[PDB]
Design a protein around this nucleic acid. Structure first.
Lengths: 136, 198, 76, 130, 82, 154
RNA sequence: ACCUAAUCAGAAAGCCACGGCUAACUACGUGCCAGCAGCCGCGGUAAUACGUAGGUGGCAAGCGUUAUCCGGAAUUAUUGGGCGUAAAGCGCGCGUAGGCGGUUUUUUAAGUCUGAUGUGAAAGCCCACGGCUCAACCGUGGAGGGUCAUUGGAAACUGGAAA
């Protein structure tokens, strides 16, 4: 507004918040690295084999994996692709991005470098799922 | 970085009948693939500057990183960034080879440069994207007369520009002046080029 | 006082110098006081000696220790 | 109360042009006797008189129109009003509509136009536009 | 000492021996909003024999340090009014 | 002869009250690439037959735009209602940048300039009426030289 | 570093997409399922919007995905917004500091104006060239800092001072 008021208080701009909460900050030090920052990726360790549904009008079935992350906290997940060589308490790489119409799930289990290593059943969409073909 | 594959898909699917991947045509009722008078023709409002970006990119055989790195070489000229870009594409060593009639395409003009058979001022220049500065000439090495493919270009005269001295069999040239438009091209405005880059 | 120095610059496999002067307390790479001009080590497509003795005599008055291979510039 | 009446003069320039009036009777002083006699030598007003008594003498304005009863003055914009002061650079004051109008500056020499400042590179307060 | 900078300003209060505070005015321009703004640092000043009173306009020279903020040195009396 | 483009069409009516209306419309800009443009709106239920009614509505509208052969004479913020485009002259050689409703009007007057973006425009009808309101208010030097001195100002 | 002479075009190419946006389409299998999803969402009995081959488009020794930051966002708006009903005018007076202050003439130069000097070192971005066979980088020149200190002229408005 008035140039008198703008001297007396500047434009304190709009804060934003992260779309994906449970990563990427200095958390809660407890004389060791009790919890840390994972900007793109991490390890995991699993806790539960997941089976769930979307909720809005949709009626399909989905297979998450409710884990405890490497910084004491609890998140859901998802395995893209077909195969599932995963059981309880097995290491899984992470990468962010929510899943719409599921009520509370958080990230994608990377199908390349983990115990989630390689998914067969795919032949054209490949590097999104970690499937090889050394002929070409 | 080089474009290979002499199939007519560069001419027929773009549309223009230039001297690129095959000077003739044989499946003239159709476009490539099942795209044809049968099936979907996908047009756009940004495809009118796409096809003045895609119309040149296969012509010299250049990648995407080359044009943007040459779009702002015309920024060093006192004309605007879209005004002298076709001049700097007309001043490269590759299209001056075909302008001297020493090769038979612009792509055959890049084959006989890197393999040492065409030089500049005696010193071995083997760069197809070499900028011909004014006041320089065109050279060869001592083994350039035995080859049939230069003698192929001695058989047939191909293309005459206006900014050179024209020697189709002597294998030495002269860059007398900086070019202008409609000497090397014939069909492209300098106004649909620049709008793609914004 | 001060010591006459050649700041080495230059990329891989190609050094190049700039004639400077500062105390030995100052290092080679930087905190250099003045520059009396460049110096040209390689001689192919390049000169071989370069100096400007106008502001070089300003430093031989208050004291200067040229290194014994730099003194071959100013002997010529 | 009435703060900076120089804008109130240039308000009534816009008022009479809009409803297409002829006679404009405003009080004005030696600040504004320097003002409107710029544009008479620039082509906006038919005739500007002088103030009668230099304090309470009203300066009558008879505005200039076109032959088609078409408007000559498009609009007006104050620049340096009380609360934000604008002063001109050396040769870097801006142009009105790519040079087609008068930007009024009162430099260290008196009220001139933005054309006359580029012969002596002066700054001064950029008062109004056209 | 003999040639130091000068901050002429009003004398606020003589409250102890050999000590006053001589306030000055400084209008500072803002970074981007353009409109100037006042800031008035109130610097303490040694004076020789309680020569100042409340309200004087003076002339100030610097010195070499004495104590906490007693860093200036009064010279003149431009105005001796109240 | 002129040139036309279909900017937008809609499917606007009320579905069933006991009798169905489901009509279309169009907003066609017409031009000649010499400096005279226009725009008009008609409506019918057979799909491309409302275009011929819409080109019928725009041939009765011509707007003369001054030009220095490639750009505009000065800058202006063409505003109508809730829309506001900004337009400013370029140097010859850079082309007309988009604003799609405002893109196709500036090419049918025949210029090659920059175009600053639609500031507060939302819908493709008020982009068009703010474009034309910008173009019909520019000024020459000669008409200014009528009601002033005779080309002194340089 | 360079460079000649040899059996040999023979060793030396991917990767994501292809409803709409947005650049690029077809035939079946499953068929609100294994799924997919940046939003509109395409899936209840194939489905141009899921895996598959064909086809195409993009970039190219590199292609996609993630988390983070700026632009898109005139969506913190000095350059560049808003308050009757959409988010927003204190329930309303006296009122301290503060902000802004009509007209006249004369000084002062505190702002403002321009002149002069010194300084805000290399190196980068840009403005140019012998050269590394071009180029990335080096080389030389060039512009780039003052809301500063100090050194003269002008008195138009804003400001202290006389009527």
């Amino acid at each position: 507004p008035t140039i008198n008021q703008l001297v007396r208080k500047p434009r304190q701009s709009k804060i934003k918040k992260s779309d994906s909460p449970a990563l990427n900050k200095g958390f809660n030090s407890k004389k060791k690295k009790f919890t840390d920052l994972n900007s793109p990726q991490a390890r995991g360790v699993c806790t539960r084999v997941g089976t769930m549904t979307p909720k809005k009008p949709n009626s399909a079935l989905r297979k998450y994996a409710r884990v405890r992350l490497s910084n004491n906290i609890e998140i859901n997940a998802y395995i893209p692709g077909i195969g599932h060589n995963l059981q309880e308490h097995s290491v899984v790489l992470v990468r962010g991005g929510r899943v719409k119409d599921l009520p509370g799930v958080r990230y994608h289990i990377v199908r390349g470098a983990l115990d989630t290593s390689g998914v067969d059943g795919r032949r054209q969409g490949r590097s999104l799922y970690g499937t090889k073909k050394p002929k070409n | 970085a080089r474009f290979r594959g002499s199939n007519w898909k560069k001419s027929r699917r773009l549309g223009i009948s230039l001297s690129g991947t095959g000077k003739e045509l044989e499946k003239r009722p159709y476009a490539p693939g099942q795209h044809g008078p049968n099936q979907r023709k996908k047009l756009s409002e940004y495809g009118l500057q796409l096809r003045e970006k895609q119309k040149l990119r296969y012509l010299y055989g250049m990648t995407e990183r080359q044009f943007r790195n040459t779009f702002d070489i015309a920024g060093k000229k006192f004309g605007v960034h879209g005004e002298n870009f076709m001049i700097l594409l007309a001043s490269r060593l590759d299209a001056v080879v075909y302008s001297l009639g020493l090769a038979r395409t612009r792509r055959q003009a890049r084959q006989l440069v890197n393999h040492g058979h065409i030089l500049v001022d005696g010193k071995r220049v083997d760069i197809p994207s070499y900028s011909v500065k004014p006041g320089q000439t065109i050279s060869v090495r001592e083994k350039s007369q035995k080859l049939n493919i230069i003698v192929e270009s001695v058989e047939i005269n191909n293309f005459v520009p206006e900014y050179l001295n024209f020697d189709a069999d002597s294998l030495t040239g002269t860059f007398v002046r900086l070019p202008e438009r409609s000497e090397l091209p014939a069909e492209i405005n300098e106004q649909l080029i620049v709008e793609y880059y914004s | 006082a001060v010591k006459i120095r050649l700041t080495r610059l230059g990329s891989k496999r190609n050094p190049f110098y700039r004639i400077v002067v500062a105390d030995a307390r100052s290092p080679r790479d930087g905190r250099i006081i003045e520059q009396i001009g460049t110096y040209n080590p390689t001689s192919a497509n390049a000169p071989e000696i370069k100096v400007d003795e106008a502001l070089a005599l300003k430093w031989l008055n208050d004291g200067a220790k040229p290194t014994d291979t730099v003194h071959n510039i100013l002997s010529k | 109360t009435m703060t900076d009446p120089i804008a109130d003069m240039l308000t009534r320039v816009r008022n009479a042009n809009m409803v297409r009036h002829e006679k404009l009777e405003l009080p004005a002083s030696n600040i504004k006797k320097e003002i409107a006699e710029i544009l008479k030598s620039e082509g906006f007003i038919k005739n500007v008189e002088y103030v009668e008594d230099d304090k309470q003498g009203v300066l009558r304005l008879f505005l200039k129109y076109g032959q088609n009863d078409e408007r000559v003055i498009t609009g007006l914009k104050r620049i340096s009003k009380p609360g934000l002061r604008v002063y001109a650079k050396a040769s870097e004051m801006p142009k009105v509509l790519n040079g087609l109008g008068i930007a009024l500056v009162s430099t260290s020499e008196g009220v001139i136009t933005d054309k006359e400042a580029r012969k002596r590179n002066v700054g001064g307060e950029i008062i109004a536009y056209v | 000492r003999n040639d130091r900078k000068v901050y002429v300003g009003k004398v606020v209060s003589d409250k102890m021996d050999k000590t006053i505070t001589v306030l000055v005015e400084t209008y500072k321009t803002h970074k981007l909003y353009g409109k100037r703004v006042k800031y008035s640092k109130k610097y303490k000043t040694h004076d020789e024999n309680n020569s100042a009173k409340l309200g004087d306009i003076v002339k100030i020279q610097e010195t070499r340090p004495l104590s906490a903020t007693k860093r200036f040195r009064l010279v003149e009396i431009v105005e001796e009014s109240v | 002869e002129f040139e036309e483009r279909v900017v937008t069409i809609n499917r606007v009516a009320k579905v069933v009250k006991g009798g169905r209306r489901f009509r279309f419309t169009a907003l066609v800009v017409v031009g000649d690439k010499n400096g005279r443009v226009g725009f008009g709106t008609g409506k019918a239920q057979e799909v491309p037959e409302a275009i011929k009614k819409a080109v019928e509505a725009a041939k009765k509208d011509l707007v003369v735009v001054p030009r220095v052969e490639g750009t505009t004479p000065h800058t202006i913020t063409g505003r109508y209602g809730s829309g506001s485009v900004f337009m400013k002259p370029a140097a010859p050689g850079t082309g007309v940048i988009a604003g799609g409703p405002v893109r196709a009007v500036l090419e049918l007057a025949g210029i090659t300039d920059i175009l600053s973006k639609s500031l507060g425009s939302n819908t493709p009808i008020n982009m068009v009426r703010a474009t034309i309101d910008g173009l019909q208010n520019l000024k020459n030097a000669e008409d200014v030289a009528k009601l002033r001195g005779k080309t002194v100002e340089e």
